[model samples]
Target: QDHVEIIPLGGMGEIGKNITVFRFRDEIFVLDGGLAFPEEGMPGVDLLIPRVDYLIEHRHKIKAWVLTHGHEDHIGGLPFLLPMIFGKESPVPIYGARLTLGLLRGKLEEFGLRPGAFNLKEISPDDRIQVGRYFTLDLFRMTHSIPDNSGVVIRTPIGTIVHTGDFKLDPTPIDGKVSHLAKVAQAGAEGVLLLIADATNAERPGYTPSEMEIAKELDRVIGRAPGRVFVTTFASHIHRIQSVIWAAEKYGRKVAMEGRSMLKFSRIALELGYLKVKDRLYTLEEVKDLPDHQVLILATGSQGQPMSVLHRLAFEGHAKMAIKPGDTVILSSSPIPGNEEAVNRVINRLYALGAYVLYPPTYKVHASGHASQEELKLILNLTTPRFFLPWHGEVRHQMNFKWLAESMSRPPEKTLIGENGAVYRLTRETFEKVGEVPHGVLYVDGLGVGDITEEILADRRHMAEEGLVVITALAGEDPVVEVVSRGFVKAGERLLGEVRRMALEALKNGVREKKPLERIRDDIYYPVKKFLKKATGRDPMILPVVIEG
Candidate 1:
């Protein structure tokens, strides 16, 4: 039977790297190419992206790449993924709202790619466009930290699929552009075949607070502070940045932006007419000349990235400025999961530097951009789909959303908790997990992509946990063995003598057995490693070198 296929490439079992594929026979449509920050133990990894081998193999069938927003996790992978998908020929048409395209253009420029290099199209929220012969797309406005967020409605021959991009139903959003709940309701009335929704905050109860609330709290706090105010948040949060600018203007302070991403996106927002600030803005150099009480700093690194502007300032590494006594530091975003330790470390350093810090768990300066339980339930109630699949969250969040859908009386058979690379076949009357695809994580590290292997990461973990020991043997009638250790132990007289003796014994045994150098090295390695582990109760990396005379 002819049916539609839905395959998730990423953002199914994790929080980032969100890409999905929709295929109907010959045509394929892709949504959201994004990247995720590396988790702990991924030592030296710059970022993580979804494995796109499947997409590359089927590149000829791809019709368009549709983006819902400009957040890093939504559009960050384009610089790396686009070239592979398009190669040296004409690229697929990339569609997004105005600000989304603007941000993407800026990112592309950084990679030496011009707008003319790709087929980039800017669309409105209400425009409906057809791709290939089997799929059509329509966007609905949604409120998020960043402007130009949209939920997509994919129309196919058999059924319609509604994808709620990262969203929160903020009735009184700061920009006055609320989520298009009515459109969602209308789609529901028209009978949605499947609904894929954002579940980033499914575990939280009640409705998400509007961005206006955060603005009010920021204004109050900035007005009361006697010294310079420094605010740090996610760089993509143009709405929150607008609020900080407004607060600075209301309190008679000039705003200066810090961080590379913060400066870039704010400039784009200003150029696109999304951010408005009349005369209270100053350059980074200009802020240094202004009185401390008359300056407000907007920075990046609410998540405590090591080289972010806020982290540099907190650690006295920034060349242009430093946080002084009486300075007020406001963290306007919460720490992402797995980043709590680094975030707390930065916060503690800010406090120790004599600056007053305002963060979550103590102040109401920040609000989530994802829908809470009530909002999630409301979307479910609005878009009553026959089949439900939750997106944009981890396993726990997706599972929690499944429970929410089931509580609404939707049958268990209709709701699915999916993982990356899983493919589901859906028709007008049925939905079933039919098969799987090639889905895995590809790590990018410092100008290298997919070069770092799991074995390399495992070696890094081992080296981090246990130190390294190197032994060198000079092969002759009387072998000379040298031992050196790093991160292992201090080379005391007794320990050094013991290590040397062990190495010599191993070398003598290898030679007595008439083993080759490779075999000799292997024979030397095990006993030395075993001895170190047994003697010190710690296993260190053992490197044995046998030099022929």
Candidate 2:
């Protein structure tokens, strides 16, 4: 039977790292190479990308990489991912809207990757592009956090697949580009075979509030502030930043961009005409020249990331700017999952600094960019596909989406809920799970990719919890043993003398028994571990070193 294969490498059952593969016979089409941020307990990990061993093994089969938007979870992996596919010589074609490509350009420059590194193709909502021999893709506008967000429709021989990228049906989006519901309805009328939709916010009830609604609150707050005002939001949320700029202008405040990412995104948005500033804009150095009531600072780190501008300012680490008693601080974004503690810490610090702080719970200052239950149902009713697959959320969210489908009278067999790496084979007649593929997270640490192993992380956790002990034994007939500890229990002279005596006894026993070096180390380790646990109720890592004569 002629069929197509859908393989999701990430973002099926998790919150981020969203990459999916569409295979028709010999050709492969990739959608949204994204990444997920590190969570608690993943100490020192910078980011996480989808494992691409399968893609690397079938590199020649991949025709192109199609991006839906420029969100970090949608495009952050490209820096470390693309090179693995096309080294330094051959260029791979990447397609996205103008603003999406512009944001990507900045990321590429940061990685020292030149323009020639990839075949960058900028397309519009009206463009129809052919990928390989079997797929024809049509892009349509979608209202999301960022401008130029799109949903893709893939037409194949046997069926048509619709992928609704991260979206909401905001009738009054700041940019005036509402979702193309007419196009979606037209596609539905033509009979969509399969529909893949974003599941983020699937659990939330009702429609997501329009961006204009939040703008009203911003204007009100900015107008009432008695002194300098500082606002923090996600850098990718150009709509929110645009609103802040407008509010600042309305209140006769000159806006100054803080944080590297905020400046970069603002520059790109201005260049692309996505952001409009009708009044004066000041630089960081120029902010001091303006009156306290005339200064508005737009910054990054709404999530309270360490070393971020807001984080630095909260703790008074920033040399250029500090929060004064009369300053008003607005956290214009909600804390992402797993980031509540960090965000709360920053908020507490801001309060301690005597600044008036306003955030989500107490203020309607931010609106979610993802579609809610009403919007999700609208898409379900619009697309009306034979088979439905939910993307871009955790397991519970995907399951909630599946329930939404079921409530609409779609048969359970017609809807499939899958985790990362689950393979679904589709034909004109039916959809079924046939097999599986490689799907896992690859850690990105400082200057290293996929080098941090589970064992290393475990060892780090062990050392963090238990502490470490090192023992050195001098060689010869009468050897001397010395012990040192870190993060372990403080010892009295009697206890220290006992530990040294045990170490010498273990070494002497090893020597008398003619045990190998490895055996000698093992001999010293167990008893010392036992003694430490018995004496202090602690387990510290023990390192034994023997000097040879």
TM-score of each prediction: 0.92, 0.90
Model 2 clashing residue pairs (backbone): none
Clashes (N, CA, C under 3 Å) per candidate: 0, 0
Candidate 1 local lDDT, residue 175: 90
Best by TM-score: 1
Candidate 2 minimal-lDDT segment of 10 residues:
301-310
Q: Quantify all predictions' global Cα lDDT against the true fold.
A: 0.84, 0.83
lDDT of 1: 0.84
lDDT string, candidate 1, 70-95, tens digits: 98888888888888777744568889
The number of clashing residue pairs in model 2 is 0
